[PDB]
Amino acid sequence: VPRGSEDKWRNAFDHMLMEEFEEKMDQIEHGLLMLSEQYKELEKTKSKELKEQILRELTIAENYLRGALKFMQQEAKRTDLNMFERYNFETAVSTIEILVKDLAELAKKVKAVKS
Amino acid sequence: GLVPRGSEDKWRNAFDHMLMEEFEEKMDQIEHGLLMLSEQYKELEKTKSKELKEQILRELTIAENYLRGALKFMQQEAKRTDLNMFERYNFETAVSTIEILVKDLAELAKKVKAVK
């Protein structure tokens, strides 16, 4: 890929990694949606085990997302990015930030269940 | 909430399971990419193309950054206080696998930089 293109991934690892990130992102979103459903069950049952297990899964997703965030922020700062690339890294950052926010919202709710 | 906290033979957490499968796939991909870059290093040896050299370095640098991140992450998971045997085995193996890949990357980088 010429260094001069502005409309594509110029590096093969960049493309491969975005692609790994996006799949991971949709999976996490889906897991969060499943945990929301489980929070609704928790609301009714008050099961200490469900509560604990939801908290554990939220903590692992959070850790992973904090890791991806750090990685993507750094990539966004690169000095050699074309517009396409910088856009993509910046959008990944925002997407992670929203997911982290949603996790933390759900965590608050779960902790608040009186089991 | 399903898997009992006393299982020793399986992932007890859904996100652990999900991310680890996703990690193994990625490792194989990175391995294949390193293999492709080695091939390209051989071409570089003959042609001495500055652009090929620069591009291989760039890709190596991106793969290294990603692998050092994954290494930090996996080391940390391996230090969890609540792991069963199956989980610890998996995290610890992931850590070793990442280390080997990082070493291979760095070896390839040395060779590339040495192309005049």
Numbering used by the authors:
A (entry chain A): 3 to 117
B (entry chain B): 1 to 116
Q: What does the literature reporting this entry say, word for word?
A:
Among these, group 21 allergens including Blo t 217, Der p 218 and Der f 219 identified in B. tropicalis, D. pteronyssinus and D. farinae, respectively, are known as mid-tier allergens in the allergic response. The structure of rDer f 21 adopts a bundle of three anti-parallel α-helices similar to the group 21 HDM allergen Blo t 2116, and group 5 HDM allergens including Blo t 514,15 and Der p 512. The crystal structure of rDer f 21 revealed an elongated dimer structure with molecules A and B interacting in a head-to-toe orientation. Helices α1 and α2 form an intermolecular anti-parallel dimeric interface while the C-terminal α-helix (α3) is fully exposed to the solvent.
The structures of rDer f 21 were obtained from two different crystal forms grown using either PEG 400 or PEG 2000 MME as a precipitant. The similar dimeric form of rDer f 21 protein crystal structure grown from the solution containing PEG 2000 MME, rDer f 21PEG2KMME, was solved to 2.3 Å resolution. This crystal contains four molecules per asymmetric unit, which represent two dimers of rDer f 21. Although the rDer f 21 protein structure crystallized with PEG 2K MME as a precipitant neither shows the helical distortion nor binds a molecule of PEG 2K MME, some unidentified weak electron density was also observed in the cavity. Furthermore, knowing that only PEG 400 but not PEG 2K MME can fit within the cavity, we further deduce that a molecule of a size similar to PEG400 may exist as a physiologically active molecule for Der f 21.
